A paper describes a structure:
Coronaviruses are enveloped viruses possessing large, trimeric spike glycoproteins (S) required for the recognition of host receptors for many coronaviruses as well as the fusion of viral and host cell membranes for viral entry into cells. The S1 subunit is responsible for host-receptor binding while the S2 subunit contains the membrane-fusion machinery. SARS-CoV makes use of its S1 RBD to bind to the human angiotensin-converting enzyme 2 (ACE2) as its host receptor. Here, we have used single-particle cryo-EM to determine structures of prefusion stabilized SARS-CoV S 2P ectodomain in uncleaved, S1/S2 cleaved and ACE2-bound states.
Author numbering:
A (entry chain B): 695 to 809, 818 to 823, 831 to 1120
B (entry chain A): 549 to 662, 672 to 694
C (entry chain C): 841 to 937
D (entry chain C): 695 to 742
E (entry chain C): 986 to 1034
Write the structure that this text describes.
């Protein structure tokens, strides 16, 4: 069975690259800045510093993850004036020049579907517990500049983008070069650029419908949010636990008890709350490494996919990968993969070799295919009945040594 | 209603017991401190960085002498730069744009230029251009 | 309590048996696009060609190739029957739990 | 040196994809059916 | 109880590591043909089961 026709469609791929980096002051968490707190707390020696170093090391990774993933392009390119190349319409993927948002329309659809603790917005505020969330090194605007200078680069320079300096080429030129890489002749490209453009522009509007009408494609981004929510909420909720004292309030234990026992119960209050943080440090230390595993996916799915050609199956989506376009998102990367999908199959009949002039005639590539009227060489990706010559076949040995041949002629 | 609590369980607002004014109760202040340095082999001045705090309440309580820790030899130097991460004290905000040397937060990034410690806005990369036509490789 | 998994033992090998039954007839297009009928030596001649030996070598030698891995399949059945330490990494998953 | 003959062979590998999934009744593990345990369990909160 | 849950979250991060490498070899080396050296058996890969 060999397919005839084909239909390019585009598959979305979603993965997280960073998590919300935090920090904790211990004194404003452990007690609430009381003197009776700080008295007993210094007989443990240094324990806040070990918690300061771990939450810093988590906080360094989140920038380092997003830096490696995005900043692989060292030449920021001006987004081209024409955004309509060869009949293909990149206008919803490049940043649109009208609005001062410097985002695509599609990236705007990505923020609107996934969008306590002290944080400053430059309106600053601060909470009683010592919890705080710090802002990253790389703002949201700079990421969208890297995405824009990456889509603009391969809308112009093609596969040459990552070989060094990005080298200018026509768009339909390199689109044919990616058709060689999937084992399809580029006649299919050049002779069909109208309806390939009709399909390519159709699919991007179809994904646009999807991200507006339905949801849950970016649940892998919300999941990063929901684990920051629960770990910070559960850390709060163990303030009101007593750990065996008369109260969760340090001042009630202070007031109504003698220093023979008020010392003892707030000493329980301390080590009860040191282990609540030491819990919180560890579970933040684990899933930092689960994000760092998903970070080096997105680092390799941007080099080996967007800057080159994918050869591995279902890597960069189902079907024959052609090219792929990154988009940003809050704490994540949303990919768009341009895929080649064959269709319209026909039942034909094969022969491994043909017997002619008493000799053994092998196909040089592909197979000899007999449709019921004539023999010809064509490939399995696509039907194209190339007439058997002396050139597209080759000779080794004589007839009737390999098994199951067809007696035939070679021009 | 006596007083108010937040979305969490701490008290954040109170009706005044004599005159019924609805005050807000905020924390007093705190935060972390970074020290930014080019190294002992280059300099011995640094710019400290008071994280996640309004620069109004920073600069006052240093003049009004209410920080713990307290430094023996230390001056504001009239260089306090409000940024997203905090209140940078000691580095001159240049309005230039270089590659990032030492990270701070939200595109602000310290460095050491001709010499003193400078802070600025991070550059992403070189703005190149690729001319485009349909017939040229 | 140890909970029972969602995919039982029967449905696991039902995927695997359907998977090998696919690629005995469908070829390398079984993963790329749809499963497409192809005679089996045609798949082998292709996969010879993809590793840098032209399909001269299959067609001239369709029985030496048939004899060799039909031997080598049964040697695994000898080595799985008699000896050990070839499935240790599956048992150490069971031991560490 | 150029090889002239060849030999095909099957080699095996094995990878775990799963492990045993468990669950723990926190109530019955710590207390073990004493209610006076369970009264002092509640002041430790929703740790279970 | 808290210690046991931590030493399960590590090992479930070990399984999640290698189950991604099993879903990759099954995608590449079974449903396709690999060209990656000393990956999916040794020698020149033909097909796999
Ligand atoms: C490339 O693809 C893009 C896809 O975004 C496409 O550009 C878009 O085209 C639509 C219509 O073709 C534009 O929508 C218009 O926007 C203007 C902005 O002011 C509106 O005023 C218009 O609304 C009026 O007309 C509608 C017609 O029915 C009415 O329904 C409506 O109520 C108003 O009367 C109109 O909708 C859209 O702005 C552009 N987007 C961009 C970024 O240009 C473009 O056509 C494609 N190009 C090619 C060459 O194929
Ligand atoms: C750090 O703390 C200082 C105070 O110590 C704080 O300064 C204050 O900020 C608020 C805003 O957060 C200012 O309020 C507004 O400022 C503008 C700018 O001049 C005024 O025009 C405003 O007046 C109009 O707007 C109101 C609401 O929009 C109207 O209700 C009102 O009737 C007016 O029409 C308004 O005053 C405030 O002025 C300053 N005060 C001082 C002394 O600076 C600063 O914002 C904090 N910084 C950080 C980073 O948190
Ligand atoms: C490349 O390697 C392959 C395998 O290593 C090799 O194929 C082998 O070829 C030889 C000769 O054609 C085969 O050996 C014969 O096998 C038959 C079938 O069992 C036996 O009956 C033969 O026995 C005769 O010879 C013996 C030794 O002299 C006598 O003791 C006996 O009584 C018989 O007279 C003989 O063993 C061998 O079986 C194959 N191997 C396979 C797997 O088929 C091939 O020849 C090599 N290439 C080159 C160019 O040599
Ligand atoms: C190969 O596949 C493509 C698409 O998969 C085929 O193109 C489509 O062909 C159909 C007819 O089979 C066209 O439908 C017609 O459309 C016009 C205008 O919309 C309408 O007036 C007709 O009534 C009918 O609906 C369709 O437009 C066309 N698509 C495009 C983008 O051109 C193509 O025909 C296939 N090749 C062969 C040889 O059949
Ligand atoms: C089988 O393929 C051959 C070509 O390989 C087809 O023969 C051609 O038929 C068209 C129209 O019928 C003619 O214009 C050409 O001159 C023929 N060329 C040759 C070389 O024969 C044949 O039609 C195909 N059969 C079927 C059923 O599609
Ligand atoms: C407590 O006493 C003060 C003054 O003694 C009250 O303040 C007066 O409040 C009324 C309305 O509540 C105003 O009309 C008067 O103008 C206020 N007095 C002055 C001198 O300005 C206050 O209301 C009292 N508290 C309560 C709860 O009633
Ligand atoms: C501090 O930096 C200075 C450079 O200004 C270093 O001094 C020079 O080091 C190089 C090699 O490291 C030698 O070739 C020169 O002869 C050195 N010059 C002098 C005047 O010593 C110095 O070693 C550095 N010190 C540290 C501790 O980093
Ligand atoms: C080759 O084409 C490139 C297309 O950009 C030309 O590059 C620019 O040319 C302008 C003036 O012609 C210069 O100001 C720019 O600095 C060039 N940019 C780059 C990246 O080279 C280039 O001039 C052409 N070269 C020749 C020999 O025709
Ligand atoms: C490709 O772009 C070139 C511009 O460099 C177009 O070539 C010009 O076309 C106009 C009319 O279409 C002529 O008057 C000019 O003399 C052409 N100049 C050159 C340098 O070729 C060309 O039309 C574009 N291709 C297509 C298919 O429109
Ligand atoms: C044609 O191919 C389809 C799909 O493989 C198959 O179902 C059908 O039976 C085939 N027809 C013939 C005549 O072989
Ligand atoms: C194909 O199989 C049929 C039986 O199904 C057999 O008669 C025929 O000889 C076979 N042909 C080849 C080339 O193996
Ligand atoms: C092909 O036909 C010729 C007669 O024209 C015959 O001599 C030859 O043996 C045939 N070959 C095969 C493989 O049947």
């Amino acid at each position: 069975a060999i397919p005839t026709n084909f239909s390019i469609s585009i598959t979305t791929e979603v993965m997280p690259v960073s998590m919300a980096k935090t920090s904790v002051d211990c004194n404003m968490y452990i007690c609430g800045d009381s003197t009776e707190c700080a008295n007993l707390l210094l007989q443990y020696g240094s324990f806040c510093t070990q918690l300061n170093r771990a939450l810093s090391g988590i906080a360094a990774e989140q920038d380092r993850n997003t830096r490696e993933v995005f900043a692989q392009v060292k030449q920021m390119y001006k987004t081209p004036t024409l955004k309509y190349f060869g009949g293909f319409n990149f206008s919803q993927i490049l940043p649109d020049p009208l609005k001062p948002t410097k985002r695509s329309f599609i990236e705007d659809l990505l923020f609107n579907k996934v969008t306590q603790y002290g944080e400053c917005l430059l309106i600053c505020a601060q909470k009683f517990n010592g919890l705080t969330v710090l802002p990253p090194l790389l703002t949201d605007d700079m990421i969208a500049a890297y995405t824009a200078a990456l889509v603009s680069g391969t809308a112009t320079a093609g596969w040459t983008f990552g070989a060094g300096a990005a080298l200018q080429i026509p768009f339909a030129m390199q689109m044919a070069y990616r058709f060689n890489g999937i084992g399809v002749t580029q006649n299919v490209l050049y002779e069909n650029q109208k309806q390939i453009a009709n399909q390519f522009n159709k699919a991007i509007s179809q994904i646009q419908e999807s991200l507006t009408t339905t949801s849950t494609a970016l649940g892998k981004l919300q999941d990063v949010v929901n684990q920051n929510a629960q770990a910070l909420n559960t850390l709060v909720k163990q303030l009101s636990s007593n750990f065996g004292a008369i109260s969760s309030v340090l001042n009630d234990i202070l007031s109504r008890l003698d220093p023979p026992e008020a010392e003892v119960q707030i000493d329980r209050l301390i080590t009860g709350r040191l282990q609540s943080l030491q819990t919180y440090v560890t579970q933040q230390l684990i899933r930092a490494a689960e994000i760092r595993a998903s970070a080096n996916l997105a680092a390799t799915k941007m080099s080996e996919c967007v800057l080159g050609q994918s050869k591995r199956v279902d890597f960069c989506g189902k079907g024959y990968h052609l090219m792929s376009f990154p988009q940003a998102a809050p704490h994540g990367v949303v990919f768009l993969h341009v895929t080649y999908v064959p269709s319209q199959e026909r039942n034909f009949t094969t022969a491994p070799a043909i017997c002619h002039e008493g000799k053994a005639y092998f196909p040089r590539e592909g197979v000899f295919v007999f449709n019921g009227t004539s023999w010809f060489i064509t490939q399995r990706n696509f039907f194209s009945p190339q007439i058997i010559t002396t050139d597209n076949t080759f000779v080794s040995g004589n007839c009737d040594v390999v098994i199951g041949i067809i007696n035939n002629t070679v021009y | 209603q006596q007083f108010g609590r937040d979305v969490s369980d701490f008290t954040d607002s109170v009706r005044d017991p004599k005159t019924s004014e609805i005050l807000d109760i905020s924390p007093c202040a705190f935060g972390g401190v970074s020290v930014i340095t080019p190294g002992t082999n280059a300099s011995s001045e640094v710019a400290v960085l008071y994280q996640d705090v309004n620069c109004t309440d920073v600069s006052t309580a240093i003049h009004a002498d209410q920080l713990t820790p307290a430094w023996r030899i230390y001056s504001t130097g009239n260089n306090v730069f409000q940024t997203q991460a905090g209140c940078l004290i000691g580095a001159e905000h240049v309005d230039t744009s270089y590659e990032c040397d030492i990270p701070i937060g939200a595109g602000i990034c310290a460095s050491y230029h001709t010499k003193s410690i400078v802070a600025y806005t991070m550059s992403l990369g070189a703005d190149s251009s690729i001319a485009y036509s349909n017939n040229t490789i």
